[PDB]
């Protein structure tokens, strides 16, 4: 559907709080980065700078498959329903704000 | 119900004091880790780093069945009523604080 | 009320010292930029150049809702009462100077 | 087809919002600048001044292969379909305005 | 009283030496971060970057209850009188310097 | 053949689960680190940081003999056929993905 | 067949209760350790640390002949049918769980 | 008097050599940990990690009664005059060094 | 031979992906920076800013020994044949493009 | 004595190499910035931009106490005799050049 | 020899591409500006406007030591042989054109 | 004599391999840190970040007694002649390189 | 001669298998630890952690008399010719590998 420029700073910080908690067992932002067809060296470069989830979403702005619904189904494919229950209405509320800005 | 981000540092330390006392006979954090569908190698990786209960709860943040009530009923399924009598009101008090933060 | 041209260089530097301290947790200038209906790409463009709070106030000069009182109530909506206690009398003192310049 | 003077300020700002978000992994304006046969020192000179995408399009005004359709196919060669879905109708609407100005 | 901008780099380093010694038993900076109404994911994000006490004080700059006396009474509520006996006169000496800078 | 940048995060975590189970009798990651011509002090430095198998593979990125097939035959020389039966098809599936990324 | 990572913590504790009862006459874990081609000094090193059956199974993770069926036939070769009658269905139930995790 | 930050690494290792020799009869570091008002689960958590005397002194850094003279009188209350005869002049020599660092 | 202005953005990013993976054991970009006669404080200054390999190549633009072949033989002297097998044809392809631009 | 315009680019880079190595323990440029009566928010603003020592000396150009000898005695008050032994003759050589330019 | 009016726009742009790449480590145009006896405030004024190398050469038009050979030996004194190998024949070709214009 | 900026990355890594092997009995980097008049909380802060020997040498850059010969005699005072026999000629070879850079 | 960093993981495990078999009559690792001038409390601290021979060799890395030949003659002074007949060629083979690494 619509690109990830609809997601403003408040949602993109709340995704960061969940996803850059770096765990060796479960699906942190590196599992998401692998599901978005990033090379290992790209993920390893994103590990260095702070907020790697935000830089991951910035690097996944211009990619041939990127959208908001693709992000919401990749977060379901990872099984992390932690984020879709809290960022459920906020992502829709920032979708409708971007649509109203496009009028 | 609500995710394990409602559980702040004070409760998550008091669960750690009970659960990472590693016993060969009774139900320590490894029995809880088995009840949360972790592989043996995941539990064996969590044994290495300090506070394995806290890293266990961090790795069980994003999992398809995780919640606070699921944790409270898995601690009942293990029979450890040691923790539910002391962390009874504290888990509710940090549930209501997270709800009030969501307003 | 009156536009943000009443705010001269001394107040606009003291807002910059508080607001462009970039934090991942609390409300820096990006939370304020989101509260003023800026797109994510606008905020991301303002991050690049130095003094992003000053360029944020320059980009919020000509906007349909902009005023001094709107700024003072958006800084209350973010909860940052750090700035309203120190820039309390200075914003009024530069309001009254702009009024006296209009005579 | 027709040169890049057909692209007025509104499209050239919306390309700037997408393309000068400088990422180390994906295709920002420097990948586009490399696809338009610029030397490394030219791109390095364009990095210094603000809005490097606008100065990139100004430096690619007079070049032997430059057109609007060449820009639209170089943005497809980079795979960034982020911009062609939002700047789809606007580039055509400013093409038809330039044609009507030529009568 | 007065905000935490009165606390310069020397005091803010000496608080860091005491408070980011991370202990599982006593009150390190995470107990202080919980006493300042931070979510678990905020504290978990502050654990990642170096000097978490300094980033904790930066994130507690703009918060509705923040002051120097609030910090001095939260360090008493944690019972850590280690810091109030050594940073006793230094916090007052940097309070009086900030007051003299305000004249 | 092809370098270890073909091995993305999912395989490199599954090698970590088998290989950093530290045993005194059998061949854990330290036997593999010795087979890759590392000094004792290098292995002793890799023991300190978490995920020593991942940091071992990162330190064996740029080495004169490193490849994917060299890793698969060093894991056979150690006799650990535990990993080649489960990471059999996954290493080939991430080889073919890296080849398709090179086109 | 499938490796010993299928055996989670509950089965690996119930094997430990039977097998590390150290007897001079019958077949405890040292007879099993001899049947798995361990040297005397390896078994003597495993005697020192607590739960020697669990460390024995960890040291027999990566070995050229190790599997679950090999363990079940070595426990038959020792004649200990004490364990195969109680850990009969549990080893199959944790085999099928590992297969379902591999999907 | 003065806090336990006066005690540097050499004294804190020599206390560790005496006190973490774990005896069932006499007063090792657990008797000292009980005399410093630690809960049983705190002491049981300190038993797990290596150098429990050093982690005990780190956890007794910020506590309402902690000082160097309190430590020297709690080691007298336990009757262990083994440590006060060898760490007699060294604790004073590191007290006077901390005082000279405070000037 | 020819200077490092022949190396455009695509090669200079692919060198960055390999070389700024910062390892304590092997030869990352700091070993290369030492082989190019940089002082420790220069390398320590280059560590601070992002993409230190790109800023390293920019600081090694104007140096008395710098060329493309010198870079290719210093990457052989470090033994990193990881980069010469993938950036083999690309460095020649951007050499021949710079020569054709010089005509 | 004479102002800091006597210090040209070569000395001001060599002070930068020593002083902006950011350490948590010793006296980097932030201790010097505190000794020159800068507020915490000023130092925090200078941390953001690259070469903070050079921007620190630029912000300490016009200040009521600034001179070259004041800088040389503040670098002695911090105890950093690292810089006065190497930038000993160079600061005098650029003092005498500024005097000869004033004739 | 002959003044810098012999250097036309094409050479003066190619010197600009090399020299105004602003590096903190090597010799950019500010090292050249220091070698031509400019004050720090002059160089700091030249930093503000775009193409600082061209404005540097314009400000070094009328100076008592300025010539083309002085520029070619100051670029050798800085060790930047990057520019003398590419702007070797072009500076001579624009010297001979200026001589032929003087006839 | 000469400061620790003479010691480049290769020597400073080889000191790190010997000195940050953390032992409870012998003289690791913490004994060296105590011999260089660091407080316990400084050493405890240096323990947290990786390569504590390198950060120890960075924090001992600007200190009133620091030099290369002081380091070589403090490593003799600790009795560690392990490092002076292997880093014997390398420290002199990087001393003479720094002297030749000073010319 | 050469230090104990020449002894890699395979020899250091084979010494551990012989030497940490703890006997009350013969010469285990504690007799060797006494022959290397360790205090009783040091040996008693090394008894606690697993592989006490490896931690004994790590604590005897930096000691004024430590070498490989000193170890081989202290194992002869204890009369244990069990280890010199099996670790005869392996210690020489890892000596020659360390020499070839020093080239």
Author numbering:
A (entry chain F), B (entry chain J), C (entry chain C), D (entry chain B), E (entry chain G), F (entry chain I), ...: 19 to 121
Publication excerpt:
The human genome encodes ten TLRs and all, with the exception of TLR3 (Akira et al., 2006), require the cytosolic adaptor human Myeloid differentiation primary response 88 (hMyD88). Receptor ectodomain dimerization facilitates association of its cytosolic TIR domains, providing a scaffold for the recruitment of other TIR-containing adaptor proteins, in particular, hMyD88 and MAL/TIRAP (Akira et al., 2006, Gay et al., 2014). hMyD88 also encodes an N-terminal death domain, which is joined to the TIR by a linker region, the intermediate domain.
However, unlike the arrangement in the hMyD88-IRAK4-IRAK2 death-domain complex, each hMyD88DD subunit—with the exception of those at the end of the filaments—resides in an equivalent environment. Type I and type II interactions occur between successive layers while the type III interaction occurs within each layer. Interestingly, although the hMyD88DD construct used has a 30-residue segment belonging to the intermediate domain (ID), which links the death and TIR domains, this region is absent from the reconstructed maps, suggesting that it lacks ordered secondary structure. However, our finding that hMyD88DD spontaneously forms helical filaments whose architecture is identical to that observed in the heterotrimeric hMyD88-IRAK4-IRAK2 death-domain complex (Lin et al., 2010) suggests that the helical arrangement adopted by hMyD88 during signaling is an intrinsic property of its death domain and is therefore independent of its interaction with either receptor or adaptor TIRs.
